[PDB]
């Protein structure tokens, strides 16, 4: 129940976007609907907190918590190219 | 201030007179007192007064407004200095109506800045407490003098506000303030400017003149000319990184009301950060200040020689006459090498940053697009830092960059850095993006027509192979780009803008002149509406020195900012 509220105004708002022919904004909009829907499910499955982190320091804190098959899988979802990936797992895990 | 006289208009006489007027309030509010003060207006208030100066008019205290009740502080008078900002309304009344009521009184009186407002003393009056206020006065500080040659009212909001938000409250403010430079330094004769905000300054200096009905000014005129420019004229220069001395203490660890804080391992005695005041009080930085980095480290060593050979010299003082002499040197001998020391561990300070691998790498990308290359392409740098998350605020300032060198960039393109800023940054930055956006610096391209490089062409902006050491043009200051806002202002003194018609027009706003009557080397006020950064700062104070019969400047601004203060004032706080 606790991201109901927060996931009614990002669908005002895509709306919105929407009206005022910005389809950018409602797209992102509309995945950052996605991911916060995500993001519960993951403190619901595994505890600790996900909530209101950027898609790469979801992926990040999943690498580092050891959920590497998931992590994966999310960066994949939102369509992360292999560069970009490859760059966030050497920040991940360096001194 | 000596250095407040050092070039061509006295502005002691400007800072004498809002110290005295300061000063004529403080002694209105008769006894010891407490000064409560709104925090925004404690940094730039002390280019004007320190305590040292309040101190001798009974201000035994200074307390931050807060809510509840006021510290406990055996005084005869609380003194709020205060924006009027209906919020801090509030806190003031609960301050007010939370006094212990037994016992002696404190009286209390309010010092409005920069202006008071009919609005916020209604709403006192609603809260039930206008009556306890024996004066309410305001404080009308919008110039404020930085050094010689330079003035800033420091409103950090002044571009969001004018181009974004509609509100200009900060130009009426800017016209104010020149309505105060002409009670003290005469009439300005002459007009000129280019952009939207600097059609409405012109508009309100001009409303404000015909509207006063004191004494006809019979002050002989210090400033010859005015030019007002928009900040929006020119959007290129604040992004790129500046390369002076000045500028890249700015860059790297940010001035604030000329004061600089250092990391303090390098200097006395080595815990807290070195705090340096930075202005043309002392001569060494007075050199170098304006100077490209590259040609500072040759001004040090010469220094070091001199400094290093007049202490060797205290061997040779063997005699009784000769050590009288030496011993009335040595206090500016110690100074010397103290400035020295100061400035030769600031120089390490900034090469540790300027040979590093990463900063050449963004100088290559940032000369790349200012000299007209692969400015519609996705640019692997730029992907690299925001795959590694490099501070946000170096990205935008590259993409923004970007985007004004293309006149925007395509959807495609726009598009794949939008995405990627908000997957790594977070989606909260959207609006950060539609602020760059309407702002004019990260939009999509309309038709497929560019003109910077007719800009840049035709007033020259961009040379290779610069004298930084040497210099011969404006372009030093940013090893080869020459800032366009100072363009403009050496093209308007010479041959005048006849002969850039065509590119005028392509530029934000209007061009336009006016004058101003008179009762029966050219001094230029140049005022920028929405900040200027340090390094055009430089540009114009090398104009200026050159003997070549034009003009000399001098500066104003709404705000002294660079790149990246700039784009933080147009984020919402997080």
Same mark, same amino acid.
């Not at chain 2, 860059?251 to 807290?272: C, M, R, W």
């Not at chain 2, 590259?294 to 400094?307: D, H």
């Not at chain 2, 490099?390 to 393109?413: A, D, E, P, T, W």
């Not at chain 2, 140049?526 to 019969?549: H, K, M, N, P, Y």
């Given at each position: ?95 | ?75 005869? +008078?609380? @003194? %709020?200095? !205060?924006?009027?900002? /209906?919020? #801090?309304? &509030? ?125 006809? +000014?019979? @002050? %002989?005129? !210090?400033?010859?000319? /005015?030019? #007002?420019? &928009? ?128 900063? %050449? ?214």
């Amino acid at each position: 129940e606790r991201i109901e509220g927060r996931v009614a105004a990002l669908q005002t708002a895509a709306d919105a976007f929407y009206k005022a022919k910005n389809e950018f904004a409602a797209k992102a909009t509309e995945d950052q609907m996605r991911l916060l829907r995500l993001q519960r499910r993951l403190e619901d499955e595994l505890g600790g907190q996900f909530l209101d982190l950027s898609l790469h320091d979801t992926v990040t804190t999943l690498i580092l918590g050891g959920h590497n098959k998931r992590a994966e899988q999310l960066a994949r979802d939102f369509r992360i190219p292999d560069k970009r990936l490859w760059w966030l797992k050497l920040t991940a895990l360096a001194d | 201030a000596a250095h407040l006289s050092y070039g061509r208009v006295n502005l002691n006489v400007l800072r004498e007179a809002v110290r005295r007027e300061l000063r004529e309030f403080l002694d209105k509010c008769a006894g010891s007192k407490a000064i409560v003060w709104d925090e925004y207006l404690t940094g730039p208030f002390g280019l004007i007064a320190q305590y040292s100066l309040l101190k001798e008019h009974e201000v035994e205290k200074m307390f931050t407004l807060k809510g509840n009740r006021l510290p406990a502080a055996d005084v005869k +008078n609380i @003194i %709020f200095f !205060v924006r009027p900002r /209906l919020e #801090l309304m &509030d806190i003031i009344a609960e301050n007010v109506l939370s006094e212990d009521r037994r016992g002696p009184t404190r009286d209390f009186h309010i010092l409005f800045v920069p202006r008071r407002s009919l609005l916020c003393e209604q709403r006192l009056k609603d809260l039930g407490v206008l009556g306890s206020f024996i004066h309410r006065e305001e404080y009308s500080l919008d110039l404020i003098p930085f050094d010689g040659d330079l003035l800033s009212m420091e409103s950090e909001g002044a571009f969001k506000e004018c181009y974004l938000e509609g509100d200009q409250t900060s130009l009426y403010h800017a016209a104010k303030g020149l309505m105060t430079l002409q009670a003290l330094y005469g009439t300005i004769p002459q007009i000129f400017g280019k952009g939207e905000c600097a059609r409405q300054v012109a508009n309100m200096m001009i409303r404000m003149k015909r509207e006063f009905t004191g004494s006809q +000014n019979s @002050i %002989f005129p !210090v400033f010859d000319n /005015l030019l #007002l420019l &928009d900040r929006n004229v020119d959007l290129l220069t604040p992004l790129a990184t500046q390369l002076t001395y000045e500028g890249l203490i700015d860059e790297i660890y940010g001035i604030q009301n000329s004061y600089v804080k250092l990391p303090p391992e390098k200097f006395a005695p080595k815990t807290e950060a070195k705090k340096l005041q930075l202005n043309s009080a002392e001569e060494l930085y007075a050199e170098i200040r304006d100077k490209n980095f590259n040609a500072v480290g040759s001004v040090l060593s010469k220094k070091a020689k001199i400094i290093s050979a007049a202490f060797e010299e205290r061997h040779n003082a063997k005699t009784v006459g000769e050590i009288k002499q030496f011993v009335s040197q040595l206090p500016h001998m110690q100074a010397a090498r103290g400035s020295l020391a100061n400035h030769t561990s600031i120089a390490e300070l900034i090469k540790d940053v300027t040979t590093s691998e990463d900063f %050449f790498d963004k100088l290559t990308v940032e000369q790349e697009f200012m000299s007209g290359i692969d400015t519609d392409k996705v640019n692997n740098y730029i992907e690299d830092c925001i795959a590694q998350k490099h501070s946000l605020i170096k990205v935008l300032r590259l993409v923004c960059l970007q985007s004004v060198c293309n006149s925007g960039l395509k959807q495609k393109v726009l598009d794949y850095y939008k995405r990627e800023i908000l997957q790594t940054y977070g989606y909260e930055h959207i609006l950060t993006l539609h602020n760059l956006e309407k702002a004019g610096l990260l939009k999509p391209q309309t038709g497929g027509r560019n003109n910077y490089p007719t800009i840049r062409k035709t007033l020259r902006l961009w040379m290779d192979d610069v004298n930084e050491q040497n210099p011969t043009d404006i372009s030093y200051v940013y090893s080869g780009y020459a800032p366009l806002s100072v363009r403009l202002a050496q093209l308007l003194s010479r041959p005048g803008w006849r002969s850039i018609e065509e590119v005028l027009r392509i530029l934000p706003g209007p061009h336009f002149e006016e004058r101003q009557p008179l009762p029966t080397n050219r001094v230029t006020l140049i005022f920028f509406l929405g900040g200027v950064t340090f390094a055009e700062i430089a540009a114009l104070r090398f104009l200026s020195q050159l003997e070549d019969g034009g003009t000399e400047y001098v500066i104003a601004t709404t705000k002294l900012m660079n790149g990246t203060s700039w784009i933080e004032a147009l984020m919402e706080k997080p």
